[PDB]
């Protein structure tokens, strides 16, 4: 007659239906991706609509159940994750307007157009256009023109759309008893109900600020190194006092800086560690790659795959006989069925991606023991970090030599290690300050601390002061600059990448310390240690039943998010940058203007 | 997924050993008396699991049987298979012809 019995009955009646509908939706999506026809898309859409309707009905039914009388933390968290009203807090007209805005933004942004003047043709899409233009470009004029055309033509037409979007987001946040949308985004990391392990929302911002301030020296040294390399490579193209331009970063959004690796490498005369030629010249395929990955995972301590994983996965491109997507997607079903869909080649990047997907599948099988409302990591960064740490530990030269990818007579030169550290820096830290600045700007624009006529002004002033990137030509207030990304136009967070970057380093440091291995972190081995694997699996099976702070303390030992593994890993590269930048200026000044 | 395998999930009290339930009345969750229909305090306790050929260990169907060995004041009806060796025509041996 109490509320706890009714809540347990509702949960037991809902979990089976939720798992069944999730399995049906996953099967429909798999049949659609593996077979592009006219009926598979309709079946997938019908399954998604039925799942959404059932979830909305169950949420409306569960909203009538209180949350204070229930003392169970797991049931309380499941109800909090299930009773989410979503967009139903607003009116029907506002909801349909928001949906139409989201749909039109998704249709406009996912296509793109170049449309060069005085040329009635060659106006390709986003992927065959600006992507391939800025991929391997070595000219300043064309890069500046592409940047101007991308920020001006697609910057002024999306200003009212983005304004209406942020207004509707603020309205939905204030209607759901939240002060702002950033508060609703940060509430996911907050854990309560556990004494001595709760984490306040205000402490996360302070921890992120402290980590950013501690990373600041490394980022300044990296910026000085990149500026010196650009001055030595492009004379009279970058001032030693001003900031770096935006169109010379090798990326439209400045996420990956791997395009300048071949140009900023000091020891480019040395051969790389690519094992693609060593495998393509012998009898090797994706099957052997996945077998070696499974052997590595079982040597670390991870459980084995099911019989359905090695019979339903399509690890080979069928060709022109049927359309099949080659994008790596972590297919999770939670009902014993697991599969990976990726056209894995015999390269090294595909090997790391396959290791990442196998780590994702291992995490899925780990937390599959929990109900559907708990089959997920503690935060939105652990699910990716569990695979990223394995992909990084598998890329060690010692592991490739033990397997057979690397020749035993290959000498261990420090130049290759320095180049690998520089590449990891350029591909990891090259977007962390931009991520932090974007997250802070979105939080301030959702809270209401930025004037309406100063959005782009504050954006550019933070990009010049906090970040070391400056625009070559100033733009007016009619061009919506921050709306040039994909996550900002599709309602996706951005701090998740930074949290994942911290958590992967934390997990790598924990696994290296548990393995009783000595030396640096870039060559620290994780395999051949069942104790570390068991300690990791004890945390992977927790899911959302326990707070993330206790989960991190059970494996790492720290009470909150830590950043010291990143410094311990980048210490050799930091000392190398300090030694190389002895006769060069470090930092950037906001007084200089390249206009 | 198969949905023909029904099962009982919620009951008001524990069952006795070697007992089979026939009545399939709805379960009462709250203090309000259920009038034969579902509601906030009345839910159907009978559900059905889903068995798929792609499910791993823990979700596969397993046929389990229970053998009960009981003895009381009655003649035995089931025994073990008694073996029989090869007889010898003329030799001093020990014999056992049905007891
Ligand atoms: C994986 O297979 C190995 C090989 O027999 C076995 O020793 C181990 O117990 C298996 N682990 C799991 C989780 O099935």
B48 DSSP β-pair partners:
B6
Helix (H, G, I), strand (E, B) or coil at A105: helix
Q: Give A499's strand partners.
A: none
Which residues fall within 8 angstroms of residue B61, CB to CB, at 6 or more apart?
B5, B51
CA distance A331 to A339: 6
A534 ligand 1 Cβ < 6 A: no
Write down the number of H helices and E strands in chain A.
23, 4
Q: Is B2 on the interface with A (CB under 8 A)?
A: no
CA angle B91, B95, B99 (to 5 degrees): 170
B chain contacts of residue A19, beta-carbon cutoff 8 Å = 50
Give residues with Cβ within 8 angstroms of A448, minimum separation 6: A170, A180
d(CA B28, CA A451): 57
Q: Is A10 on the interface with B (CB under 8 A)?
A: yes
Residue A34: phi and psi, rounded to 5, are -80, -10
List of chain A residues whose C-beta atoms are within 8 Å of the C-beta of residue B1: 20, 23-24
Query: Could you give the CA distance from residue A464 to residue A477 in angstroms, rounded to a whole number?
Result: 17
Q: Which of B18, B85, B12, B9 is nearest to B45 (CA)?
A: B9
How far, in Å, is the centroid of ligand 1 from the Cα of A351? Answer: 24
List residues bridging with B51 in a β-sheet. Answer: B2
Could you give the CA distance from residue A327 to residue A343 in angstroms, rounded to a whole number?
Answer: 8
CA dihedral (A368, A369, A371, A377) positive or negative? negative
Angle between helices A530-540 and A286-300 (to 10 degrees): 90
Give the β-pairing of A469-470 and A244-245: parallel
Cβ of residue A304 lying under 6 Å from some atom of ligand 1? yes
Q: Give residue A421's Cα distance to chain centre.
A: 20
Annotated active-site positions of A, please? Answer: 357, 487
Where helices occur in chain B by DSSP H, the ranges are none
- Report which of A409, A406, A384, A412 is spatially closest to residue A394, judged by C-alpha positions: A406
Pick the residue whose CA is nearest to atom 10 on ligand 1.
A304
Sign of the Cα pseudo-torsion (A458, A461, A466, A472, in order): positive
> Distance (Å) from the C-alpha of residue A335 to the closest C-alpha of chain B?
6
**Nearest 5°: phi and psi at A74?**
-65, -45
Neighbour tally for A148: CB within 10 Å: 16
DSSP state of A302: P
> Which atom of ligand 1 sits closest to the CA of residue A303?
13
Report the C-alpha dihedral over residues A397, A403, A407, A411, rounded to 10 degrees.
30
Please state, in angstroms and rounded to a whole number, the distance separating the CA atoms of residues A359 and A522.
19
Q: Which of A551, A547, A542 is nearest to A506 (CA)?
A: A551
Contact A143, A240 (CB under 8 A): no
On whether the CB atoms of residues A161 and A440 are closer than 8 A, the answer is no
The answer to whether residues A46 and A34 touch, using CB atoms and an 8 Å cutoff, is no
Instruction: Tell me how far apart the alpha carbons of residues A127 and A214 are, in angstroms, rounded to a whole number.
Output: 37
Q: Which residues contact B30 (CB under 8 A, 6 or more apart)?
A: A1, A6, B40, B41, B42
SS3 content of chain A, % helix, strand, coil (to 5): 60, 0, 40
Q: For residue A262, what are the CA distances in angstroms to A118, A138, A212, A233, A250?
A: 34, 12, 28, 12, 12
Contact B50/A5, CB-based, under 8 Å? no
3-state SS assignment for residue B21: coil
Burial class for A556, CB neighbours closer than 10 Å (0-12, 13-18, 19+): buried
A13/B contact by beta carbon, under 8 A? yes
Partner residue opposite B54 with nearest CB, options A6, A9, A336: A336
Q: Tokens 């080979």 sit at which residue?
A: A316
Q: Which of A489, A494, A460 is nearest to A163 (CA)?
A: A489
Secondary structure letter of residue B3 according to DSSP: -
Report how far residue A32's alpha carbon sits from residue A280's, in angstroms, rounded to the nearest whole number: 32
Alpha carbon dihedral A82, A83, A84, A90, in 10-degree steps, equals 150
Length of chain A: 595
Pairing outcome for strands A329-332 and A338-341:
antiparallel
Mutate to test the interface with B, among A7, A10, A11, A13 (most CBs of B within 10 A): A13
- In whole angstroms, give the CA distance from residue A188 to residue A186: 5
CB A69 within 8 Å of CB A75:
no
Whether residue A448 lies within 8 A of chain B, CB to CB, comes out as no
A298: number of Cβ within 10 Å: 15
**A142 by DSSP, 3-state: which?**
helix
A9 touches chain B (CB under 8 A): yes
Under 8 Å CB-to-CB from A319, ≥6 apart: which residues?
Answer: none
Q: Which residue from A198, A351, A386, A375 is spatially nearest to A276, judged by alpha carbons?
A: A351
Q: How far apart are CA A64 and CA A70, in angstroms?
A: 13
**Which technique?**
cryo-EM
Q: How far apart are CA B65 and CA B68, in angstroms?
A: 10
Q: What is the largest CA-CA distance in chain B?
A: 86
- How far apart (Å, rounded) are the C-alpha atoms in residues A467 and A226? 14
Is B54's CB within 8 Å of A19's CB? no
Identify the CA nearest to A334 among candidates A357, A377, A366, A290. Answer: A366
Report residue A161 as tokens: 């759309």
Residue A251 tokens read as 């990326």
């Amino acid at each position: 007659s109490t509320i706890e019995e009714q809540a347990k009955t509702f949960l037991d009646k809902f979990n089976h239906e939720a798992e069944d509908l999730f399995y049906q939706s996953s099967l429909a999506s798999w049949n659609y991706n593996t077979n592009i026809t006219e009926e598979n898309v309709q079946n997938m859409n019908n399954a998604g609509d039925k799942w959404s309707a059932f979830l909305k009905e169950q949420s409306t039914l569960a909203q009538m159940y209180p949350l204070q009388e229930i003392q169970n933390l797991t049931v309380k968290l499941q109800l909090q994750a299930l009773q989410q009203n979503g967009s139903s807090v607003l009116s029907e007209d506002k909801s349909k307007r928001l949906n139409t805005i989201l749909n039109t933004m998704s249709t406009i942004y996912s296509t793109g157009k170049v449309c060069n003047p005085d040329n009635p043709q060659e106006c390709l899409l986003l992927e065959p256009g600006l992507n391939e233009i800025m991929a391997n470009s070595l000219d300043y004029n064309e890069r500046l023109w592409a940047w101007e055309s991308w920020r001006s033509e697609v910057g002024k037409q999306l200003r009212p759309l983005y304004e209406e979007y942020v207004v509707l987001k603020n309205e939905m946040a204030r209607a759901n008893h939240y002060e702002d949308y950033g508060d609703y985004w940060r509430g996911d990391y907050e854990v309560n109900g556990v004494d001595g392990y709760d984490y306040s929302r205000g402490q996360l911002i302070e921890d992120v600020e402290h980590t950013f301030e501690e990373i600041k020296p490394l980022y300044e040294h990296l910026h000085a190194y990149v500026r010196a390399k650009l001055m030595n490579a492009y004379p009279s193209y970058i001032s030693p006092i001003g900031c770096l331009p935006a169109h010379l970063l090798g990326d439209m959004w400045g996420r990956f800086w791997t395009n300048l690796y071949s140009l900023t490498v000091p020891f480019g005369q040395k051969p790389n560690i690519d094992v693609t030629d060593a495998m393509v010249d012998q009898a090797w395929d994706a099957q052997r790659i996945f077998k070696e990955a499974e052997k590595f995972f079982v040597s670390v301590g991870l459980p084995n795959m099911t019989q359905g994983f090695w019979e339903n996965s399509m690890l080979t491109d069928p060709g022109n006989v049927q359309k099949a997507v080659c994008h790596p997607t972590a297919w999770d079903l939670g009902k014993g069925d697991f599969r990976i869909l990726m056209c894995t080649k015999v390269t090294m990047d595909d090997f790391l991606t396959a290791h990442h997907e196998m780590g994702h599948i291992q995490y899925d099988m780990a937390y599959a023991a929990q109900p559907f409302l708990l089959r997920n990591g503690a935060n939105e960064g652990f699910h990716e970090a569990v695979g990223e740490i394995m992909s990084l530990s598998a890329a060690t030269p010692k592991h490739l030599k033990s397997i057979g990818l690397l020749s035993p007579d290959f000498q261990e030169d420090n130049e290759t290690e320095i180049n690998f550290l520089l590449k990891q820096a350029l591909t990891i830290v090259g977007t962390l300050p931009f991520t932090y600045m974007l997250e802070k700007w979105r939080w301030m624009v959702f809270k209401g601390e930025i004037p309406k006529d100063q959005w782009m002004k504050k954006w550019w002033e933070m990009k010049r002061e906090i970040v070391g990137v400056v625009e070559p030509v100033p733009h007016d207030e009619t061009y919506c600059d921050p709306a040039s990304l994909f996550h900002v136009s599709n309602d996706y967070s951005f701090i998740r990448y930074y949290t994942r970057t911290l958590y992967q380093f934390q997990f790598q440091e924990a696994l290296c310390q548990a393995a009783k291995h000595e030396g640096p972190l870039h060559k620290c081995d994780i395999s051949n240690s069942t104790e570390a694997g068991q300690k990791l699996f004890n945390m992977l099976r927790l899911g959302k039943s326990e707070p993330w702070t206790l989960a991190l303390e059970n494996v790492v030992g720290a009470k909150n998010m830590n950043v010291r593994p990143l410094l311990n890993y980048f210490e050799p590269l930091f000392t190398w940058l300090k030694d190389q930048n002895k006769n060069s200026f470090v930092g950037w000044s906001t007084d200089w203007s390249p206009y | 997924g198969n949905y023909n395998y029904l099962y009982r999930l919620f009951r008001k009290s524990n069952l006795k050993p070697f007992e089979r339930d026939i009545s399939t009345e709805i379960y009462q969750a709250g203090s309000t008396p259920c009038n034969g229909v579902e509601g906030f305090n009345c839910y159907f306790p009978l559900q059905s699991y889903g068995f798929q050929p792609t499910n791993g260990v823990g979700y596969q169907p397993y046929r389990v049987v229970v053998l009960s060995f009981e003895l009381l004041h009655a003649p035995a009806t089931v025994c073990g298979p008694k073996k029989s060796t090869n007889l010898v025509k003329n030799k001093c041996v020990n014999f056992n012809f049905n007891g």
